[PDB]
Amino acid sequence: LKESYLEESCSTITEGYLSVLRTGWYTNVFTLEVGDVENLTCADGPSLIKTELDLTKSALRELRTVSAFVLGAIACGVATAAAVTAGVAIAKCIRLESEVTAIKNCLKKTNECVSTLGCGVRVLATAVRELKDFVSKNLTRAINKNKCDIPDLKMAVSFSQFNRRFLNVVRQFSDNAGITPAISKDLMTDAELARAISNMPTSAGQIKLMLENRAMVRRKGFGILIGVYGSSVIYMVQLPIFGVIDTPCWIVKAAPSCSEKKGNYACLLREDQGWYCQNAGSTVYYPCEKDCETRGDHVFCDTAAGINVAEQSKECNINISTTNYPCKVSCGRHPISMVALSPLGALVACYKGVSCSIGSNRVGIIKQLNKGCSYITNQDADTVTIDNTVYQLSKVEGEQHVIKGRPVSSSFDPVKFPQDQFNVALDQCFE
Amino acid sequence: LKESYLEESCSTITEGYLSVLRTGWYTNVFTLEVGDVENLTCADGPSLIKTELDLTKSALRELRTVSAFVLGAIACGVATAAAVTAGVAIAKCIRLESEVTAIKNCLKKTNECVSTLGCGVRVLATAVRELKDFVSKNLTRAINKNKCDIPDLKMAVSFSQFNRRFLNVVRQFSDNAGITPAISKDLMTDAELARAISNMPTSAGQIKLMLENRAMVRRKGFGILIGVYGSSVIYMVQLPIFGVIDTPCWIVKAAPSCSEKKGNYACLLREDQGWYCQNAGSTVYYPCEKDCETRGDHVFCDTAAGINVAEQSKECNINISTTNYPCKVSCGRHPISMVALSPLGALVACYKGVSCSIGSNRVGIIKQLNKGCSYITNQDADTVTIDNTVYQLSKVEGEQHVIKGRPVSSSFDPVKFPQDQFNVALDQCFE
């Protein structure tokens, strides 16, 4: 990783991340088979089997009832809408009786099938069968003459094992109205996700990355309940297709840059913070914190959560004072001292009335910081202290650079009125 | 449903939703009885019963420790405060020792009771007794001479079945400090929610609605823990009363309307997006994204999350150019290309430097869009593409209408300064 401090606007850009951007979805339609549990009944009264069988039947019947500018809120709202709208489209293709019949009839011969749905989407289909096998081959033989207080106690213990997956899928879809926000191990085992990844029209570059980052795959995906169809539950898992990979990405973080004019503070803060990537000859901004999860150099984002931004927006990093591009800022008379922790260091703003220090656990206080912004590289100290609040710095190493320049807050005069402004272009803050 | 595209202000209004607005709370006070588990003890050391009995006792002792403008934030803060303040107000009423005695003595002869608290609020009361019956009638007979490594292995398995509910109520209240966010199946079985719904002081219209939408009932409600009392645990479940029903509701979604003159952009975005309903001749706005939940035509909202708005605010949907009403907008030099997905279509904003297209899975690219706002009805295409990001449209059918008119951003000049403004009235953006 490489981090440039941008003294002209108290901001850092950390470069050197590799994109993993979710371009599309891949569907595994799971059929989970419960069997004729509702055709079983217990006459004996008190019974471990009856308690387990009644719980299994209740889960099946409740599942029968379930069926599916400030750019941050804008983009992450759009991404939430886009994901569920994409998934429900596939769900509505599946929902047809003819198609669930086609899926179910394919999975008679095999535990795995590929279906080309009538709407043209090609989906994997998987049978979860262990519970129907238990219900039919053993439990139905054990519940002879509707007796259920059988001495074969191994039946009852086994029953509470085989149904556990089914109960959790029911619970998760019940709690989430049929759209589970992440793919539980109950929806899809690792043995099934690895099979799905192996069976997914993508390059081995994605295949290796997806098998290494199975947890990131598992959390970027989601599930939809299709419904219950007699003795079986149909649901779909959506897996992320990461069709943009290894492109450049960077993160901007910024802290309040302030200066004292007539003895009174003028401040600016950059509002264009967060993740940026290049996609196919365009730069895309990911304005909300809930998307671009990051592991090592790999930054994982929903492409639907992106806002396209002109390539010239890089001039808000390299010489924001000269560019004619409308760099988004907030400005005003509001000198907030704070520590913006960053991948390779910390932006420390401290202003009159607040004391600011850096230290190491063994050295003690390494330095007392000047009023202003200081970029403390994470080798300069172990901690930054503000107001006696202690902030820990990251251990991770990398290149750190300083693009020197007189702060905008100092080099330009504040606008006489209105001085406080929010999410405005910089030419509007400073004369 | 019916959707009008509003070309004057790049927004859609989707109409035809039916209100289900939460006006009040119905209380079921659960008593769950654990019994004299803490008077039972195991001498044998290693034992399945001892492990289960110790876990049962630990759960009981830990539960003894537990006890309870940008309008979107302000509306949902008010709604959260209102819900807990109403719930605690009832909880405070039930806490009295004479009152929990009254409830407990009522449920001593019946599994269900109706109590009128001294506050004059009448609440349902429900016993959960299966664990006390197990502890008293069977386990206390099995544990003779404090022996617990008994050969009757059915006891230990049964014990792990009966206590499972108690452990989950404890876990949920322990994790949520006694105010759970939704009513778990462990707090209230479906067999109990159906009984509570039947007992509610409500019309059969809401009864049909609430039994069909049981998951929406279960998710709008919450629990409060009252306390532990003599080896019984007292908690209340708060169920929604939907006293405003079937009234008109509509959703506004908007995307940036931008126009170029002298080669430079003027943009506006409407900020009054989200849900509106009519209640008792008032029009009410629900600016919180987290409250209003939709199932078909029925839109389910907390009335406490509503902000009352003049009926003349509908003029921002028909005459935003000329109404004297302060239609709330943000404006500036910020041409964000984006897709606002909407019930019956998409608002597609695309502007200089960004390519925008629509297509179908079986036809290819159907059209290339002009710069500006295009309302793509969900019959026009299966997908919209922006910057090569692909957005999938909804399958739901309905009437789509277009209220033609010159975009406001074209009809008026941007104010020379301050050109960028946040959540201002429209007369303040345009000269």
Partner: antibody, heavy 124, light 107 residues
């Protein structure tokens, strides 16, 4: 039993339009596709297109796209074929047929049940 | 576009005899080839869906065979009920395409 009661015959001028109908019955209407197919007397069967009765989504053959439009009413369980700018070459029997699906998925689908073919005559 | 080709264009036959009818695609349509019987003035009726399969209600004397490019329908011992036009249909592609038909006619 599964029955597709089609409309009786009609006659039209060239350049006119025709709206054929097919009442479905005996099956869960939304669950199975309906295909419309054509038989010009003296020629083999010809596929018009299909409609998904649940979503109303359609596919039209390249040779009829723009001239045909399929439709359904989910309340009347009824299906319609609308065909615009008729020609003498559109003198044919039009058939309504229920699709059923390969275990390969409903993209691979044949026509289980057929309606009484509506003959339509296009003439001066 | 899969042209289907069907032979013979008519087949003179007698009751009891073993009629067999051939349809050839122009690409490997795997088994995705239905067969239909049409009596004159009546809607077609599905006999075989996957090239070896058999529709639930239809007489067991009908039997389909073949996979890939070439297919056949056989009638194991023809009955006076069976004299009709027959069509193959591929369903591997859109458009759905049908054989030109063959009429089994009384010798």
């Amino acid at each position: 039993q599964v029955r597709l009661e089609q409309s009786g015959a009609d006659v039209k001028k060239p350049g006119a339009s025709v709206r054929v109908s097919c009442k479905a019955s005996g099956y869960t209407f939304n669950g199975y596709y309906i295909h419309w197919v054509r038989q010009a007397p003296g020629q083999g069967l010809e596929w018009m297109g299909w409609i998904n009765p649940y979503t109303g989504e359609t596919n039209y053959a390249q040779t009829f796209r723009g001239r045909v439009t399929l439709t359904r009413d989910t309340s009347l369980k009824t299906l319609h074929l609308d065909l615009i700018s008729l020609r003498s070459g559109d003198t044919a029997i039009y058939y309504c047929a229920r699709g059923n699906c390969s275990i390969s998925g409903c993209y691979y689908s044949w026509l289980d049940h057929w309606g009484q073919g509506t003959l339509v005559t296009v003439s001066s | 576009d899969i042209q289907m080709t069907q032979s013979p264009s008519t087949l003179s036959a007698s009751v009891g005899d073993r009629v067999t009818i051939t349809c050839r695609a122009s690409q490997s349509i795997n088994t995705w080839l239905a067969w239909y019987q049409q009596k004159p003035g009546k809607a077609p009726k599905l006999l075989i869906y996957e090239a070896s399969s058999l529709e639930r209600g239809v007489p067991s004397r009908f039997s389909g065979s073949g996979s890939g490019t070439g297919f056949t329908l056989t009638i194991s011992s023809l009955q006076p009920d069976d004299f009709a036009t027959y069509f193959c249909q591929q369903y591997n592609t859109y458009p759905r395409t049908f054989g030109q038909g063959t009429k089994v006619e009384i010798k």
